[PDB]
Design a protein around this ligand. Structure first.
Ligand SMILES: [Cl-]
Ligand SMILES: [Cl-]
Ligand code: NA
Ligand code: NA
Lengths: 214, 208
DNA sequence: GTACGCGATG
DNA sequence: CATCGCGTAC
């Protein structure tokens, strides 16, 4: 179709046109996502679900709709999209460096410990490190990189349980494990300067107009 | 806060009955994956209800500038906080008062919380009958006073993977069916509407 | 009944 | 160190 771009993830990350489009436009697209996922200028966690659409759409752009399977139930653990049948986890995180990234959105103490004792990395990860007005990047972290680090340090150092007596939102990858998987030689990245654009937008207008018309 | 006006104005009621299902269907279409609806649909439904308030009562009288992580309060109407909640089913069940699963913090909530704010509860029942309910703070408080915190508030069940502290189904039934609660009946009829979530973004990648 | 998605911000 | 939003479906 007319919106097609003229180890598949390796190919994506080395494609010069993809690199240029991501560097030039990912900030703008992510800014539209946040403008649609906020209230009083504060961004909701649900922005992640919209950013995920944007990243899956990059895959469709390069590889074609026939080769990207987006039809995964929204509550599926980990896997967000498949590329030529191969599962991909997408994660997004804002900060000077990524911190506190979740592996599962479970807070119950018993279920969290069950996860710690059973989970290991299985899926290729696309991690977007957002750092507004500064430098971040998008990272392709192969399943085997995650497995290497997990094998080396063990579950008890890789996985951080929710802290009891606080109000958290899930089981996290440890900050040390995250930094190690992001910086492995076999991890690929596109660096991004997250420059903001003067784009505005009132979330309520569409709906007020639908109430008012006719 | 004049919310009773919305529930007594025949003309606005008619627009709500004719248009709420369509708008809520769009919200679901934009909050799904593989045709399964995400919890975040509630945040978009809330925007639709706040917009109804803006239309009925005026921009000047509806404050929407509340942080997205504010507990309970979603909007203010003539200065008065309003909680908006949405729920799908044959009857409303398992509705959250706070999105805390931690056992200790959930207990603390149980021990300290009481109803304070007017509630707009939207009961969605696709292809059947539901409604929009205005449940005044005083109705919630009266039921809470009669049955007590331990019958009104349901703690997250330990050893399961839930999402928060709930109003009990007993309490929800009582506040919904109270004589002083007002409602607009809604026939939740689906409309033929085509939409693809990814198209916008694929097209922007191509244009970019 | 019980499974589960999405991180930003004090 | 910590705080909090949003229910569906299975
Ligand atoms: Cl991960
Ligand atoms: Cl309530
Ligand atoms: Na994800
Ligand atoms: Na709400």
């Amino acid at each position: 179709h007319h919106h097609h771009e003229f180890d598949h993830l390796k190919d994506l990350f080395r494609d010069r046109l993809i690199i240029d489009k991501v560097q030039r436009r990912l900030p703008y697209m992510f800014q539209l996502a946040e403008l649609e996922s906020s209230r009083a200028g504060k961004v909701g966690m649900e922005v992640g679900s919209l950013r995920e659409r944007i990243i899956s759409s990059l895959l469709i752009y390069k590889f074609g709709e026939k080769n990207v399977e987006t039809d995964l139930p929204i509550t599926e653990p980990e896997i967000d999209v498949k590329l030529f049948g191969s599962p991909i986890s997408i994660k997004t995180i804002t900060g000077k460096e990524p911190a506190g990234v979740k592996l599962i959105w479970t807070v119950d103490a018993t279920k969290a410990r069950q996860f710690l004792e059973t989970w290991h990395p299985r899926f290729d990860l696309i991690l977007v490190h957002i750092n507004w007005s500064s430098l971040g990047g998008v990272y392709y972290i192969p399943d085997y990189v995650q497995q290497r680090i997990f094998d080396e340090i063990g579950k008890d150092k890789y996985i951080k349980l929710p802290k009891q007596g606080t109000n958290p939102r899930g089981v996290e990858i440890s900050n040390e494990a995250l930094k190690e998987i992001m910086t492995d030689e076999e991890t690929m990245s596109i660096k991004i300067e997250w420059k903001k654009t003067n784009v505005q937008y009132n979330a309520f207008k569409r709906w007020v107009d639908l109430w008012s018309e006719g």
